[PDB]
Design a protein around this ligand. Structure first.
Ligand SMILES: Cn1cnc(Cn2c(=O)nc(Nc3cc4cn(C)nc4cc3Cl)n(Cc3cc(F)c(F)cc3F)c2=O)n1
Ligand SMILES: Cn1cnc(Cn2c(=O)nc(Nc3cc4cn(C)nc4cc3Cl)n(Cc3cc(F)c(F)cc3F)c2=O)n1
Lengths: 298, 298
């Protein structure tokens, strides 16, 4: 019974606000007395290609910022720019602020997204940071500033602030210090992501999950070293497997009785021969956004 | 970017409590001054096969119910049984109760699930009521009493309270009046649902979703009648299509400009010739847990 599940979103929902500059508007994140939002909000339509953010910013007063939390207008007391984020100081502390921290997630790791429009939460889903530092999100116009997060105990680890859609339909954004994931810049120019690779640790977890679910037609009796598997994997644009990843897969290996390198030998034959029309957990494509942690939990 | 998306769960998270009788514990739903929970909580481990709930309930008083809303304890002031649910009147009106309704959902309709573990939310995901009145959910031990719901403009429509997992790994529960979906009874005995069917109206809406998102390869120049299509549907364990179904699909037909019976002809070809190892909206099976409403909203 494996499926993508999001963390409950309530702790983030009480932090979503709307931020408007003139006629340009997007989502912002209200923690304590600070509102975080993409600095792109200070662009007019003409500014959106080739903006000079330091010029646009110095030309702004606090009153230019219209910050709305539901029915309530909050007043910007002060404002500073931090990389590609604005930090708006505001006259009131959010009573709903959860315990939180700002983290920089790593490729292969998952998080929940609260997709938001004009400061209003719309939906929640899980997705993963890709090796090429984009995310395959589900985002419409007005979603700029929507936030990605994980929850451990009662602490929300914010890790993603949505900025833009790339021409291929994938998405780019920043951490909550405003540093972009990947080689992107916040301008309305056509930017291409590098070629993507498959998250091997997660494909391996998925194969383990399929074995736990009773499907083992892809297992074989070949052996491989880590080095020889990594050489094959890179020829098929799969990420090489580190020994840390082998350690991460330890619990699934012990539960199923299939040594990590033996599952790699299964994967190797799948990569070289394909699936001869067979399916795994019902699909002909190897899923790579289900983490070992997700498998173990479900 | 088209994926299953759950409603933001904040309004439901504020209603989740833990209910314990002796050592038996599960989740309850706290609305105004009432906690709703499965009556199975009044079972000792020895009672859980073939219990007599009328017998067990008369032997308890308000004191025997321990209700915890996080750190706070709520005092039970009264109690009664309604079908397979207990209604516990409490001390305190939940200050966080949203605008809400209780609805009974029909087969093929979708809802979000807030999976909970002994009173604490842990995950959220979208699923559907199967034609055979079970749910293909993701529920672990301790999830009894978790709730399913939809949201329409600040009003939460509760439609499902989780009770149990069947031998096949699917799930069974009640509406918020305590009446089970399907042929099931709340006791720890092996029970089976009827044979399931694929939700034709949902597959068709998902094919429209694909057309809108650019996936056009499965279309053909052909067309079919309702009666001939249903001859194919029965042979492949799909639900028969009705004119109401066709009427429901009108807006999706208009937006894409593909007549409904034209999409049925494409579906008939997909069922008969299988897919070519190609994908529709990223998946390699015909998805049937998106309603026409879901496709529009996304
Ligand atoms: C299809 N899609 C998927 N994700 C996105 C996110 N996204 C967005 O929501 N808005 C953007 N531009 C704006 C236009 C506005 C018009 N008004 C009146 N107000 C607006 C505010 C914004 Cl932010 N963009 C484009 C974009 C946003 C950036 F932050 C950036 F650095 C470069 C960009 F090209 C956008 O991608 N849309
Ligand atoms: C793996 N899984 C998938 N869904 C479920 C839901 N589920 C559940 O969470 N609990 C159940 N039995 C209990 C045992 C308890 C032990 N303690 C200390 N407290 C307990 C409370 C419960 Cl409810 N069940 C079984 C079950 C629950 C019912 F409500 C019912 F009518 C029949 C049943 F067989 C269960 O399925 N677990």
């Amino acid at each position: 019974g494996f499926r993508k599940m999001a963390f409950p979103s309530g702790k983030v929902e009480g932090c979503m606000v709307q931020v408007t500059c003139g006629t340009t508007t997007l989502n912002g994140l209200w923690l304590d007395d600070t509102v975080y939002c993409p600095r792109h909000v200070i662009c007019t339509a003409e500014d959106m290609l080739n903006p000079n953010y330091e010029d646009l910013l110095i030309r702004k007063s606090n009153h230019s910022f219209l910050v709305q939390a539901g029915n309530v207008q909050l007043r910007v007391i002060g404002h500073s720019m931090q990389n590609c984020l604005l930090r708006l100081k505001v006259d009131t502390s959010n009573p709903k602020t959860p315990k939180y921290k700002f983290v920089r997630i790593q490729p292969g790791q998952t998080f929940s997204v609260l997709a938001c429009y004009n400061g209003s939460p719309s939906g929640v889903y899980q997705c993963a940071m890709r090796p090429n530092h984009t995310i395959k999100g589900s985002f419409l116009n007005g979603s700029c500033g929507s936030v990605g997060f994980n929850i451990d105990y009662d602490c929300v680890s914010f890790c993603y602030m949505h900025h833009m859609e790339l021409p291929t339909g994938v998405h780019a954004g920043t951490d909550l210090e405003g540093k972009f994931y990947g080689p992107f810049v916040d301008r309305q120019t056509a930017q291409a992501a590098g070629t993507d690779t498959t998250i091997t640790l997660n494909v391996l977890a998925w194969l383990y999950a399929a074995v736990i679910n009773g499907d083992r037609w892809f297992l074989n009796r070949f052996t491989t070293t880590l080095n020889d598997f990594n050489l094959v994997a890179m020829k098929y644009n799969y990420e090489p497997l580190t020994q840390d990843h082998v350690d991460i897969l330890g619990p699934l290996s012990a539960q199923t009785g299939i040594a990590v390198l033996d599952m790699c030998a299964a994967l190797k034959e799948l990569l070289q021969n394909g699936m001869n029309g067979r399916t795994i957990l019902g699909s002909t494509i190897l899923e790579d956004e289900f983490t070992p942690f997700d498998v173990v939990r479900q």
